[PDB]
Design a protein around this ligand. Structure first.
Ligand code: MG
Length: 99
RNA sequence: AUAUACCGCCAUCUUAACCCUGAUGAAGGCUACAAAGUACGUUAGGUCAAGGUGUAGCCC
């Protein structure tokens, strides 16, 4: 339901995403990502689609950022101090290629 | 006579945290082609034979 305002219409029962809105949303998201990378924030890419795990991990390594394409263990973020250490620094921005 | 006086020696028995979910109810938390889970005393005991320190008994 919450995706309806972003849908241009249904073509023979297939939803078409309105790309005029995608352009503005992508503009905002890319601007935010660039500003966070300028501030030396930790950026974590996340995606559980196994078809693109290798691509996303390579891209994360290439841009000097972080990836988590594997099974997401309970408490990675909310229990990070127990899992990583008391002084671990969490990501400042998380990007989902697949939500 | 007493270790049913102690000591020695033998033997008997006794000796968590964090994080999530449920409307932050009682409560619950697994799937790998992965979906919240991760970290000494005790004994009416034996032994007075390879050992001791005491205590009492009778003493026409
Ligand atoms: Mg005895």
């Amino acid at each position: 339901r919450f995706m309806e305002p972003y849908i241009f219409g249904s073509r023979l029962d297939h939803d078409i995403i309105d790309l005029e809105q995608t352009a503005t949303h992508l503009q905002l998201a890319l601007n935010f990502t660039a500003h966070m990378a300028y501030r030396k924030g930790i950026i974590l890419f996340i995606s559980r689609n196994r078809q693109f795990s290798y691509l996303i991990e390579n891209m994360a390594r290439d841009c000097g950022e972080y990836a988590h394409t594997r099974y997401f263990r309970g408490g990675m973020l909310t229990n990070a101090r127990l899992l990583f250490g008391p002084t671990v620094r969490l990501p400042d921005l998380i990007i989902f290629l697949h939500t």
